[PDB]
Amino acid sequence: MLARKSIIPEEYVLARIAAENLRKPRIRDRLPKARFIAKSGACNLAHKNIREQGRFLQDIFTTLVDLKWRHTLVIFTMSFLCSWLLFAIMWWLVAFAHGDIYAYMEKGITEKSGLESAVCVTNVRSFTSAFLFSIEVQVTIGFGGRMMTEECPLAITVLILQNIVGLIINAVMLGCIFMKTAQAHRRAETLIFSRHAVIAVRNGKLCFMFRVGDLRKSMIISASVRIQVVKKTTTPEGEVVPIHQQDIPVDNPIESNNIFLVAPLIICHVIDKRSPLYDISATDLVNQDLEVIVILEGVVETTGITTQARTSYIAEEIQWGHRFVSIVTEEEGVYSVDYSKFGNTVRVAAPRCSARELDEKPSILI
Template sequence: MLSRKGLIPEDYVLTRLAEDVLQPKFKAKPGKARFVDKNGTCNVAHTNIREQGRFLQDVFTTLVDLKWLHTLIIFTMSFLCSWLLFGMIWWLVAFAHGDLDQRGDDFVPCVTDIHSFSSAFLFSIEVQVTIGFGARMITEECVSAIIILIMQNIVGLIINAIMLGCIFMKTAQANRRAETLIFSKHAVISVRNNKLCFMIRIGDLRKSMIISATVRMQVVKRTTTEEGEVVPLDQIDIHMDNPVGTNGIFLVSPLIICHVIDKDSPLYKLSASDLQHEDIEVIVVLEGVVETTGITTQARTSYVSDEILWGQRFVPTVSAEDGMYAVDYSKFGNTVKVPTPCCSAKKLDEAGGIAQFKLCEGVTLRTSMRKRRASRRSRMES
C-alpha cells in the first residue's frame, strides 16, 4: 500500500480513509479463513502441483509473475551468461585460427586485438550491446566468425525483447492502478426506498478515470446440496441496484453500491442476530479500463459477518463549493445509525413490507408510551 512506500503518512493510509476512528474496530472470528483479504489478494494456497512444466510453456507470464528480486537476477544472469558463452566461442575461433600466437604484420586474424579470454569476453560485450570501441573488430578472413557475429546479434535482440518487455510489464501492471481504488472498511444494511439493502461505498483517488467500470458481488459460504454434497466455497452472484441502473458506473466521485435484499438474494433469510453467527463472506470486485494506459485493472475486497453493520448508513461526502463539487474523504467510511428492522427480509415481506412494519412499530410505541404514562399517574396518586 501507499503507506508502506512512504508516500503518505500512516494516519492517512487508505484503510483509514474507509474507517471512522470513533467506531469500534471489528475483528474477524478466530479461525475464520478469508477467501479474499481486505487488500484484494486471494487467500488461496496452491499445493501438490505435479505438472510444474506447464509454467515453462508460458515463460513470459512466469517471468512477469516472479518477484522483483528474482526477475532482476534472471535479467542480469541472462546477459552475463550470453556474454560468457559467446566470449568462449570467440576465444575458440581465435585459438583455432592461430590469432593468439604472435605473427608477422602480414597475418590477418579473424578478430583483431584478441590475445586472451579477457579480450574475447570484452569483444563479446561490444558485439551484443553494440558499443564498438574500435580496437577490436571482425575481418573477412573467417566465414565462421561472420556467422557467429550474426547469431550473437540475433540472440542479443531476443534477450533484449523478452527481458525489457518483462520489466515494462511488471512496472505497468494493472494492479498498481488499483492501489488508488478504495472501498469502505465496513458494509452496512439499512432501509433504502422502503427496501432492506446491503450497501458498500467505493471511490477513486485519482483524477484520471476508470473507463467502463463495472462492479460485481458474490457471496461465498459453505453450503450443502440436496444430495448431501458439501461445497466448502460456494460462490453465489448477487444482483446490484447501482445508481445508474446497471453494473456499469461513472466513478468520478465516491458511490454507494446497493444490493436490494429480495427473495432472490442469498441474504434474504438473514436477520441481525443470524448475521453474527453466520459464516459468510461478501466479495466485491471493481473492474475497468485505465484511461491513461488502456490496461484493464481490477480491485477486490471482501466483508465477513463482523464487518457488516446492521442498521447503519453512510454519511454524505460530496458537497457543492464555489461552483464545483468537493469530496471529503475523511467521511468516506463514516456511518450513522438509522431505524432499521432487525428481522430478516423474508419475515419483513411476510409481515407486509417496510410500510406495515413502520405502522406496527408506531402502534407498539404509542401503546408503550400510554402504559408508561398510566404507571406514572398511578405512582403520583399513591
C-alpha cells in the first residue's frame, strides 16, 4: 500500500560500480546467434507481411485427418455421444407432442387399459427410454421392444433424417481410421549426422569432411548429396544478393551426386578455384560470416516415401587440422562399426596456409 510515499531521497549519492568498475567490461554482448537452419532440421526463416488467403472449411477437415492417435479416439467418442444425444432429444419432443407420454402415464398408473393401439412411437415413455431408443436406431442394434407404428409422419421423417446422418458419421469415421492406418509406417526421419567438420590433407589438396549414417535396417535408395555455401555477395556492378546459396561439387569417382549409404562415410569436397572455400586460412577460420548447408535426399524402400534431411554448419564449429578416427575395425568374423566414435576427431599434420596459396607456393610443405 503506497510503498514509496516519501519521495525525498533523490540524487543524494549513487556514485557506484554501475559501469565505472573499470576492471570489468561495461558491455554485455549476450551472445545471440542466428543460423540459416537449426542444427536439427527446422529451417528457421522469417516470412511475414504476406498477402493472406483467408481460410476455408476444407482446411478444418484437413486438420481432422492429421491428428495424434490419442485425439482421434476422443473426437470419435464425442461425435458418437453428441449424435445419440441430439436425436434422443428430438425423439423425446416427438413423443411429448403427439400425446404419447400422457397416454402411457395415465393408462399405466391404472393397469386396467393395456391400450397401445393409438400411439406415435410405441414404448417411448421417458427421456431415458428415448435415449435408449435412439441407441437402438443409430447403431443398427434394433432391440425391437419399441416398434415405430406407421401413423405419425413426423416420427418417420425423423427416422429417415437420423438414419442417413448416422450413416454419414459412420462412413467418415471409418475413412479417417483407414487413412491413419495406411499411412502408419510414416513415423519420422532418423538420419544421423556428425556434428564437427575437419579440413584434413589428402591426395595433394585439402578437403571438407563429415560423417553420416542411418539407423533403420532399410537402406535408402537413390540417395543424393548436395552441398552449398551460404554467403552474402554483390555483383561487381554492385547489387545485394541477400543470402546467396552457391552449389559446390562433392567429389566422386565419376563426378555424380549419388551416394550408397550402408556403412558411414566421409563426404569429401575438394577445394578448387570455383569453390568459395579458396580463400580461407587457419587463423581466419574462427572469424567469418558463412553458413554451409548439406542436403541429403532419398527414398526408404519399406514405406515408399521420399525423404529429405537437412543440417547446417557454421564456421565457428568447424575445427581445422583434424580428421576422423577409423570407426570401423575388422572384427573376429565380420565387420563392425561403433557409432560411439561418431563425433570423435583426432589431429594430424595439417598445413596452416590457404589452398589459395597451396598451389601458389608449389611445395607440399607449409
